[PDB]
Design an enzyme around this catalytic site. Structure first.
Site, PDB file in Angstrom:
ATOM      1  CG  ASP A   1      -8.014  15.668  18.152  1.00 42.04           C
ATOM      2  OD1 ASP A   1      -9.160  16.093  17.890  1.00 42.04           O
ATOM      3  OD2 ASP A   1      -6.989  16.042  17.545  1.00 42.04           O
TER       4      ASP A   1
HETATM    5  C1  8Q1 Z   1       9.313   6.169  11.769  1.00 41.57           C
HETATM    6  C2  8Q1 Z   1       9.309   7.672  11.523  1.00 41.57           C
HETATM    7  C3  8Q1 Z   1       8.098   8.191  10.730  1.00 41.57           C
HETATM    8  C4  8Q1 Z   1       8.045   9.728  10.537  1.00 41.57           C
HETATM    9  C5  8Q1 Z   1       7.538  10.204   9.150  1.00 41.57           C
HETATM   10  C6  8Q1 Z   1       6.021  10.527   9.035  1.00 41.57           C
HETATM   11  C7  8Q1 Z   1       5.591  11.363   7.794  1.00 41.57           C
HETATM   12  C8  8Q1 Z   1       4.083  11.317   7.406  1.00 41.57           C
HETATM   13  C9  8Q1 Z   1       3.412  12.699   7.129  1.00 41.57           C
HETATM   14  C10 8Q1 Z   1       2.105  12.670   6.294  1.00 41.57           C
HETATM   15  C11 8Q1 Z   1       1.207  13.926   6.383  1.00 41.57           C
HETATM   16  C12 8Q1 Z   1      -0.174  13.743   5.764  1.00 41.57           C
HETATM   17  O1  8Q1 Z   1      -0.508  12.685   5.311  1.00 41.57           O
HETATM   18  S1  8Q1 Z   1      -1.342  15.163   5.705  1.00 41.57           S
HETATM   19  C13 8Q1 Z   1      -3.084  14.704   6.194  1.00 41.57           C
HETATM   20  C14 8Q1 Z   1      -4.147  15.327   5.278  1.00 41.57           C
HETATM   21  N1  8Q1 Z   1      -4.739  16.610   5.716  1.00 41.57           N
HETATM   22  C15 8Q1 Z   1      -4.724  17.136   7.013  1.00 41.57           C
HETATM   23  O2  8Q1 Z   1      -4.162  16.503   7.900  1.00 41.57           O
HETATM   24  C16 8Q1 Z   1      -5.390  18.482   7.282  1.00 41.57           C
HETATM   25  C17 8Q1 Z   1      -6.935  18.543   7.175  1.00 41.57           C
HETATM   26  N2  8Q1 Z   1      -7.600  17.748   8.198  1.00 41.57           N
HETATM   27  C18 8Q1 Z   1      -8.361  18.334   9.237  1.00 41.57           C
HETATM   28  O3  8Q1 Z   1      -8.433  19.560   9.220  1.00 41.57           O
HETATM   29  C19 8Q1 Z   1      -9.062  17.451  10.332  1.00 41.57           C
HETATM   30  O4  8Q1 Z   1     -10.172  18.198  10.662  1.00 41.57           O
HETATM   31  C20 8Q1 Z   1      -8.227  17.213  11.638  1.00 41.57           C
HETATM   32  C21 8Q1 Z   1      -7.448  18.466  12.000  1.00 41.57           C
HETATM   33  C22 8Q1 Z   1      -7.282  16.051  11.387  1.00 41.57           C
HETATM   34  C23 8Q1 Z   1      -9.167  16.851  12.903  1.00 41.57           C
HETATM   35  O5  8Q1 Z   1      -9.474  15.558  12.943  1.00 41.57           O
HETATM   36  P1  8Q1 Z   1     -10.806  14.910  14.052  1.00 41.57           P
HETATM   37  O6  8Q1 Z   1     -11.277  16.190  14.693  1.00 41.57           O
HETATM   38  O7  8Q1 Z   1     -11.703  14.292  13.018  1.00 41.57           O
HETATM   39  O8  8Q1 Z   1     -10.071  13.955  14.963  1.00 41.57           O
END
Ligand code: 8Q1
Ligand code: CDL
Ligand code: CDL
Ligand code: CDL
Ligand code: CDL
Ligand code: PLX
Ligand code: PEE
Ligand code: PEE
Ligand code: PEE
Lengths: 55, 347, 122, 98, 49, 115, 88, 140, 54, 175
Positions: G43
């Site tokens: 991925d």
């Molecule tokens: C130590 C413990 C830690 C635990 C805590 C962690 C908490 C952090 C959570 C933060 C969440 C965010 O930032 S949310 C991130 C912002 N938005 C998204 O993730 C959705 C939209 N992206 C897409 O649809 C892409 O197409 C994709 C599916 C990625 C495909 O990627 P490739 O096909 O290009 O590889």
């Protein structure tokens, strides 16, 4: 064979090579006081034993 | 630094040296050394930079260790004889501590490592002071206790100083490190004759101080600290380069220049004591110092190195500050060989 | 290593004891004084050269002061040196006189009665 | 000699070796210098008291005064070194070589 | 000719020149008198003249 | 002899009080209880991090001014000497330089803390 | 002296090492020409982790725009060679 | 310590080759130990075991040089029936030089060490014979 | 025909931090033109404190 | 022979010197130096130097407080080292302890010249003077003599102190 090679090799070139090697050995220090003061301790230990016991 | 503060610090350094000179009590000599170091540390740091800070720190550590050894030797001598006068130490172990302490203060081999680094890390004025004035006090102390020194240790340190000075100076492109290694070799020459004649040590001190003062002043006048920077002086001040070349030949000990007389007198005095091998090795080794002096003279005055375009602008300006004693020091560094019998006035 | 600093009756910082006045002073045309004056003249010329002045003609009063100072110092330097050598000779002769058993006078033989070895060159 | 004299002399020797052998901290070496001074003070005081030399009872005080001067000098240099590097390690002082 | 101050102007510093000349003259006269006194003392001590 | 016994008794009493305090009561130590305290929360950094000293210059001066006390404490015995004029001159001379050293550091902004 | 004159073969070996140390890759089905997205089935997020591992391995940062182009080990080796100025 | 030098010099020249060889070996080992100590102090070996190895190599080389020199000099002096002769010391010095060259595995180093060490040993023997002083006492 | 004089290539032999350059000292760099090294980015971290709530 | 109190005090002096010479964290180095200063004060007290020992204790207490402040300012690490947290520090500490043990053993069980000369022991009480006179302390009189005999010493000491203040201010300026 003699003037351009061996007479050059023996007196002047040997002197130049030896002095260059000794200069490289003497002057190439890393500038760390740790090594210098360790050598100072070694020198002190020698003077008190190889010289201070002989009188 | 406030000029008044700088004057006070220089006067304090000189007064500590004079206290070492005039004292009959070992505690007062130690006090003079302490005061000299205390006033000396800021002078190395007058122009602030990390290199100056490092040089001052190394100098302080070395001199403080030497002072501790000095005091310990004084205390041993007091223990084995209730004496405070500096006449002749009564314990061989205390005398060995004293010798090692004074050699570390002077920078004799194998305690030489601090001299080139401290000299490189400071300005040319501080280098001049460090390599001229800082030698007087330990040399005076060694002169007063000359009859007590062990000749083997002193002569070993002197020979090591000469050899290491030559070898280290062979490898330098920075002028301050060249002068520091030259100083180490000259200190070795001076301490080689001390167990035999202190007058020879005093004469060598005077001539070396004169030559070193002339050389440092010539280096300040042509504001260069590297070989290539000094290579440009011919295109702006040819007279300075010619005087530098003559002074360098004098420092190499070539006749009929002044630098030859101390080596000549030391060799003849040592031969009076049936010492033949060591003076021969000493001269054959000072050949190395002459070699790197000749390399500097080749790069500075005897050939003409390429210059830059901006030197034309420097051509239009004179020197704002002039050194009053530079002319006298050059003449004394070169043309004083015929006045040799005057050394009897030194004893 | 310190020969004559501990000599009895030596005042520390005179540079010229009163006993030195019994010796003839150096003549004012002494060649050593002339050499000191020449050294002063060379110092004056070098001073002119460094300051980018006409070497020979620029400072006449300065060159005169240079020569005068060098001659003035050299006169007293020569006096002290001659006095020190006189002291050395005086002490040497006194010690030789007071220790005859270490400096004996042995009869010298003529070369007709001394047998030397001959080494032919061939 | 008394065995206390040997103990004080070995204290001086140990402090001298500690100064001569360097670890990372500059401060540790200053403490070794202060220890050498303390051993010198103790030894000189014992020698002066044993022989009843009245006038040198003031000499160790002068020793202490110049010890304080040395310590102040070392601390000032340490301040400048740590301001330069953020640490008093000796291995940072390697800009200058032989 | 020159644009600015030029601290040595057409005339020389007469104070400095006078001081230098006076110093030289005083030194020479002092040396002459000292030599004369030395010669007289040496003669008187050894009974020459 | 008596002073060593007194010091031993005092140190022994203090150590015995520590022993009683540490062995008499019931102990229930767990990680949350023994953790470092910062009023509600876990510390961000370590307590062993460098802590800046803004009075660093006055600390160096204290070293030199503390030895002034060593030179001045024999003064009650010095007042019993015959040459009182010399002792008074030297005692007043020593304090004058101590006053001048304070005046120098005061006028050159040495007593103000680093910002 | 400093580190020896790093060459292409060492760079390629280190890249294959760090890729074989990645758990989501078959140790024996991975080749220098394998495509992460198509050949290995990785991925985009997986690729970002791989780029981060490369940055840890070779000790220099990689911008995103350069990282998005890097779709096979050979491209990574070529990029490292270009950035470090290595011809062989 | 010069006591080692005296233990070497107490034995007569052409007698007791094993004892003189042992004394020269001890002198060489002491010299090598000092050299290795200074080398470790001024150039860290980056590991304890590498420092031990450097000390071992230096000390073994110096001790081998001393052993070869002493053995060869004593054997030559006793076989030639020529004590008080610089030739024995020259031969021993060249033997030690060849030993050093074989240790470093360098033909040029071997030849140079032969020549210089032999010349130095012959000079030392001459100084012993005629009483030359290196660290002369201040007689005058 | 004129006397030979040193050129840039000849002059560059003395421009290094040390003569007789070896493998170890090849990485030595000559000191700055003025004796001033550039300041290091050794940022001194401030101490972070929880003031309250208790 | 008699209770060997000064022997124990000097042994603790050497132990503290080994403690701060193995060079652990400067906090523990200063602690070792404080212990050494206290036991040295006791040693000097046992030979009649009340003023000198007490004064050196006071001076070193002030110095070590300044040193503690400076250690917290500029000589800290995330994990300060103790005598058992590092192989080098522990090795140095053990080597110093066993060297002192060897010296003491070879000193009291036979007579050897360690470095300078030899000694048998016999305790410190032997070398005393049994002098019986006075309404004063000779140490106090000798120290008070500094203001009547030691004018030169007072002058040089005061000048050195003033110069030291000026010097520290010059060094810590920066720019
Ligand atoms: C130590 C413990 C830690 C635990 C805590 C962690 C908490 C952090 C959570 C933060 C969440 C965010 O930032 S949310 C991130 C912002 N938005 C998204 O993730 C959705 C939209 N992206 C897409 O649809 C892409 O197409 C994709 C599916 C990625 C495909 O990627 P490739 O096909 O290009 O590889
Ligand atoms: C015999 C052995 C052979 C010879 C010995 C070896 C010679 C080496 C000497 C090196 C000296 C170094 C030096 O001065 O500058 C280097 C200097 C290079 O510097 P530079 O590039 O020209 O520019 C530097 C600027 O000065 C940049 O600095 P600045 O901008 O701040 O300019 C300030 C300047 C301008 O100065 C001023 O502004 C004047 C203002 C006055 C201020 C008032 C302050 C007074 C208060 C302090 C009192 C302290 C007393 C101490 C009490 C002690 C108590 C115990 O002042 C100075 O430059 C330094 C002043 C030097 C003072 C000399 C006075 C002698 C002191 C004697 C003390 C002994 C007392 C008795 C002892 C008893 C025993 C205990 O070298 C030279 O210029 C030529 C060399 C000359 C050497 C002497 C010649 C050989 C002998 C004849
Ligand atoms: C042993 C027995 C006695 C022997 C005596 C000892 C040796 C001679 C004495 C030494 C000291 C005296 C002169 C020193 C100050 C002069 C400085 C200088 O640069 O001169 C420029 C100056 C010419 O410049 P200018 O006239 O102002 O206008 C032209 C521009 O300035 C244009 O000038 P520029 O500056 O633009 O030109 C640039 C030039 C500038 O470069 C130079 O000018 C070289 C100056 C080096 C200074 C010498 C070092 C210090 C003294 C040590 C001497 C060591 C001698 C031992 C042997 C070793 C040989 C090195 O740079 C170069 O071209 C590169 C040259 C590099 C090649 C390497 C050779 C250089 C060193 C050679 C030194 C040899 C000894 C001095 C010879 C005489 C030199 C004037 O020369 C003179 O005119 C004065 C020379 C003497 C005249 C006075 C004579 C008195 C008048 C007659 C009265 C009769 C008396 C008896 C009465 C009898 C009854 C009737
Ligand atoms: C009866 C007397 C017998 C003779 C005794 C006197 C003669 C002693 C000769 C000593 C020769 C020293 C020079 C050797 C080469 C330099 C050291 C070295 O690393 O060589 C590596 C060289 C191999 O080359 P490499 O490892 O590839 O070179 C690496 C790099 O290319 C370059 O290597 P690197 O850069 O790693 O160099 C290591 C490093 C480390 O530097 C050193 O190791 C210097 C060592 C000096 C030791 C001096 C020994 C004197 C012994 C006196 C006590 C004698 C007691 C008896 O160099 C430096 O960091 C700079 C050194 C200069 C800075 C300051 C030097 C002064 C320090 C103190 C000097 C001596 C002070 C003595 C006390 C003074 C008290 C006032 O040779 C060796 O592997 C070690 C063997 C050395 C030959 C030993 C021959 C002994 C023969 C004894 C025969 C006895 C016969 C029986 C008689 C009856
Ligand atoms: C009154 C005046 C007299 C004053 C003198 C009296 C002094 C008495 C005080 C002594 C009481 C103890 C005081 C504690 C001082 C605190 C020291 C300290 O803080 O350590 C800092 C220092 C560095 O601190 P660090 O940064 O935290 O650690 C970083 C790592 O060390 C480095 O990391 P790395 O692993 O990456 O580095 C590689 C490794 C490399 O390590 C090595 O390569 C060294 C191992 C070589 C093996 C030696 C061969 C073994 C056999 C030889 C035996 C000779 C006889 C053989 C006979 C024939 C054989 C068949 O480490 C080193 O580079 C360090 C080298 C320094 C070694 C020790 C220095 C001695 C001089 C150097 C010569 C080395 C030995 C050559 C032979 C010399 C003659 C025996 O620590 C050490 O290096 C060693 C630990 C300290 C414990 C030993 C200290 C005892 C020695 C004191 C003097 C010896 C006796 C004195 C008098 C005896 C007779 C009277
Ligand atoms: C490069 C040539 C060297 C130049 C040297 C510097 C020249 C400028 C110095 C200024 C001259 C004044 C100095 C002395 C004048 C008054 C002080 C006088 O009282 O000192 C006496 C002593 O007089 C001086 O020492 C003599 C100084 C003369 C120096 C010239 C000798 C140079 C050697 C030969 C080269 C010729 C030089 C040419 C002159 C330019 C004290 O005797 P004493 O306290 O008991 O000895 C102390 C040393 N002891 C105890 C260990 C023996
Ligand atoms: C024990 C110690 C004894 C000390 C004996 C010293 C002998 C004096 C001669 C000094 C020669 C030094 C030569 C040297 O160090 O380097 C060789 C030098 C390095 O070149 P650099 O100019 O420094 O750098 C250019 C590139 N940047 O290389 C050369 O080409 C040398 C050329 C000139 C060499 C002249 C040698 C002449 C020797 C004649 C024979 C007698 C010499 C003295 C020993 C005699 C035998 C006992
Ligand atoms: C300097 C000022 C004060 C001086 C110090 C001395 C104070 C003297 C006060 C004595 C009061 C009696 C102490 C009673 C409290 C002891 C601690 C305590 O409460 O523990 C209770 C504990 C609960 O255990 P469990 O029920 O099995 O487990 C439940 C958890 N799972 O029960 C016990 O252990 C009881 C043990 C008897 C206590 C001994 C008291 C004897 C008196 C000693 C006083 C010392 C004087 C010095
Ligand atoms: C006098 C004692 C005699 C000592 C004998 C050894 C002298 C050898 C010098 C002749 C030249 C032989 C030689 O090849 O020198 C090299 C040799 C190093 O090996 P390399 O050949 O460079 O390594 C090859 C792969 N890079 O040079 C050296 O390291 C030794 C130079 C120092 C000689 C000893 C000088 C000691 C002077 C101080 C005496 C007190």
């Amino acid at each position: 064979l003699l003037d351009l090679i061996w007479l050059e090799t023996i007196l002047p070139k040997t002197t130049s090579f030896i002095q260059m090697k000794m200069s490289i050995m003497v002057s190439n220090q890393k500038g760390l006081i740790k090594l210098y003061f360790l050598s100072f301790l070694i020198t002190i230990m020698i003077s008190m034993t190889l010289f201070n016991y002989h009188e | 630094m406030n000029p008044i503060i700088y004057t006070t610090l220089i006067m304090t350094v000189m007064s500590g040296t004079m206290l070492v000179m005039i004292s009959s009590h070992w505690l007062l000599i130690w006090i003079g050394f302490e005061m000299n170091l205390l006033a000396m540390i800021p002078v190395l740091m007058k122009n602030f930079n990390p290199r100056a800070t490092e040089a001052a720190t190394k100098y302080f550590l070395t001199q403080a260790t030497a002072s501790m050894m000095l005091m310990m030797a004084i205390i041993i001598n007091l223990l084995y004889s209730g004496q405070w006068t500096i006449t002749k130490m009564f314990n061989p172990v205390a005398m060995t501590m004293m010798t090692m302490a004074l050699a570390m203060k002077l920078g004799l081999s194998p305690f030489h490592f601090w001299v080139p680094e401290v000299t490189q890390g400071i300005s040319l004025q501080a280098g001049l002071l460090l390599l001229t004035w800082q030698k007087l006090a330990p040399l005076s102390v060694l002169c007063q206790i000359s009859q007590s020194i062990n000749p083997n240790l002193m002569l070993t340190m002197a020979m090591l100083s000469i050899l290491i000075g030559g070898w280290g100076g062979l490898n330098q492109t920075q002028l301050r490190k060249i002068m520091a290694y030259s100083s180490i070799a000259h200190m070795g020459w001076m301490t080689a004759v001390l167990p035999y004649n202190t007058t020879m040590t005093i004469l060598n001190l005077l001539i070396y101080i004169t030559m070193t003062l002339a050389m440092f002043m010539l280096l300040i006048h042509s504001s260069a600290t590297t070989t290539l920077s000094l290579s440009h002086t011919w295109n702006k001040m040819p007279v300075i380069t010619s005087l530098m070349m003559v002074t360098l030949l004098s420092m190499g000990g070539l006749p009929p220049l002044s630098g030859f007389m101390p080596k000549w007198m030391i060799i003849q005095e040592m031969t009076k004591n049936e010492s033949i091998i060591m003076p021969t090795l000493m001269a054959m080794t000072a050949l190395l110092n002459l070699y790197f002096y000749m390399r500097l003279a080749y790069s500075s005055s005897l050939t003409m190195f390429p210059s830059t375009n901006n030197m034309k602008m420097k051509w239009q300006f004179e020197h704002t500050k002039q050194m009053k004693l530079l002319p006298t020091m050059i003449v004394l560094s070169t043309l004083v060989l015929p006045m040799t019998p005057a050394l009897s006035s030194l004893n | 290593m310190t020969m004559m600093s501990g000599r009895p009756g030596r005042v520390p910082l005179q540079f010229l004891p009163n006993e030195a006045r019994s010796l003839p002073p150096p003549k004012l045309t002494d060649p050593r004084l002339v050499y000191m004056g020449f050294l002063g003249y060379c110092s004056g010329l070098i001073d002119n050269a460094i300051r980018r002045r006409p070497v020979v003609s620029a400072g006449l009063h300065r060159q005169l002061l240079y020569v005068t100072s060098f001659v003035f110092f050299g006169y007293y330097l020569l006096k002290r040196q001659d006095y020190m050598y006189a002291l050395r000779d005086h002490d040497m002769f006194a010690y030789v006189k007071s220790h005859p058993e270490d400096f004996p006078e042995k009869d010298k033989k003529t070369y007709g009665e001394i047998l030397e070895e001959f080494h032919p060159v061939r | 000699m008394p065995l206390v004299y040997m103990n004080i002399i070995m204290a001086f020797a140990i402090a001298l070796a500690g100064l001569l052998m360097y670890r990372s901290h500059l401060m540790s070496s200053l403490l070794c210098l202060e220890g050498m001074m303390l051993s010198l003070f103790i030894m000189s005081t014992l020698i002066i008291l044993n022989t009843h030399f009245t006038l040198a009872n003031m000499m160790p005080i002068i020793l202490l005064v110049f010890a304080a001067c040395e310590a102040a000098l070392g601390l000032s240099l340490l301040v400048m070194v740590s301001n330069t590097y953020g640490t008093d390690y000796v291995q940072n002082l390697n800009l200058l070589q032989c | 000719k020159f644009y600015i101050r030029e601290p040595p102007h057409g005339s020389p510093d007469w104070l400095k020149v006078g001081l230098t000349l006076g110093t030289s003259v005083f030194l020479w006269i002092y040396l002459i008198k000292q030599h004369k006194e030395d010669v007289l003392e040496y003669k008187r001590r050894n009974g020459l003249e | 002899m008596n002073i060593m016994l007194t010091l031993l008794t005092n140190v022994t009493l203090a150590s015995l009080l520590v022993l009683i305090a540490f062995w008499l009561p019931q102990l229930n130590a767990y990680s949350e209880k023994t953790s470092p305290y910062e009023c509600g929360f876990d510390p961000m950094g370590s307590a062993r991090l460098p802590f800046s000293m803004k009075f660093f210059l006055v600390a160096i001066t204290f070293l030199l001014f503390d030895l002034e006390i060593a030179l001045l404490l024999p003064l009650p015995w010095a007042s019993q000497t015959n040459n009182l004029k010399t002792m008074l001159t030297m005692a007043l001379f020593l304090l004058i330089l101590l006053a001048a050293s304070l005046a120098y550091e005061w006028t050159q902004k040495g007593l103000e803390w680093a910002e | 002296s400093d580190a020896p004159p790093l060459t292409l073969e060492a760079i390629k070996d280190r890249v294959l090492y760090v890729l074989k140390l990645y758990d989501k890759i078959d140790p024996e089905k991975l080749s220098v020409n394998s495509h992460f997205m198509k050949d290995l089935g990785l991925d985009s997020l997986d690729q970002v982790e791989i780029i981060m591992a490369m940055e840890d391995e070779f000790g220099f940062e990689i911008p995103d725009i350069d990282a998005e182009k890097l779709m096979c080990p050979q491209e990574i080796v070529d990029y490292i060679a270009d950035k470090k100025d290595v011809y062989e | 310590a010069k006591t080692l030098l005296h233990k070497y010099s107490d034995i007569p020249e052409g007698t007791e080759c094993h004892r003189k060889a042992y004394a020269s070996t001890s002198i060489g080992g002491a010299t090598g130990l000092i050299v290795s100590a200074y080398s470790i102090a001024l150039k860290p070996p980056a590991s304890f075991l590498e420092g031990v190895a450097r000390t071992g190599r230096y000390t073994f080389t110096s001790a081998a040089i001393g052993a070869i020199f002493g053995l060869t000099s004593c054997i030559s002096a006793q076989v030639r029936e020529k004590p008080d002769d610089p030739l024995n010391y020259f031969i021993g010095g060249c033997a030690g030089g060849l030993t050093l060259g074989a240790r470093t595995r360098s033909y040029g180093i071997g030849a140079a060490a032969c020549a210089y060490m032999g010349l130095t040993a012959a000079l030392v023997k001459m100084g012993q014979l005629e009483g030359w002083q290196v660290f002369a006492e201040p007689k005058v | 025909a004129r006397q030979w004089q040193p050129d840039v290539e000849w002059a560059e032999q003395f421009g290094g931090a040390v003569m007789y350059p070896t493998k170890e000292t090849a990485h030595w760099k000559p000191p700055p033109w003025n004796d001033v090294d550039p300041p290091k980015d050794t940022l001194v971290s401030n101490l972070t404190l929880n003031f309250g709530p208790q | 022979m008699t209770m060997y109190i000064a022997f124990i005090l000097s042994t603790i002096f050497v132990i503290g010197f080994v403690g701060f010479s193995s060079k652990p964290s400067p906090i523990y180095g200063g602690l070792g130096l404080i212990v050494s200063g206290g036991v040295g004060c006791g040693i000097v007290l046992n030979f009649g130097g009340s003023f000198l020992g007490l004064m050196v204790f006071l001076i070193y207490l002030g110095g070590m407080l300044v040193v503690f402040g400076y250690t917290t300012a500029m000589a800290t690490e995330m994990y300060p080292e103790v005598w058992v947290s590092n192989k080098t520090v522990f090795g140095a500490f053990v080597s110093g302890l066993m060297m002192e043990f060897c010296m003491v053993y070879y000193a009291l069980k036979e007579e050897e010249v360690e470095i300078i000369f030899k000694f048998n022991g016999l305790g410190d009480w032997v070398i005393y003077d049994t002098g019986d006179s006075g309404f004063f302390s000779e140490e106090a009189m000798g120290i008070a003599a500094l203001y009547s005999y030691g004018t030169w010493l007072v002058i040089v000491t005061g000048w050195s102190l003033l110069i030291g203040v000026v010097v520290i201010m010059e060094i810590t300026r920066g720019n």
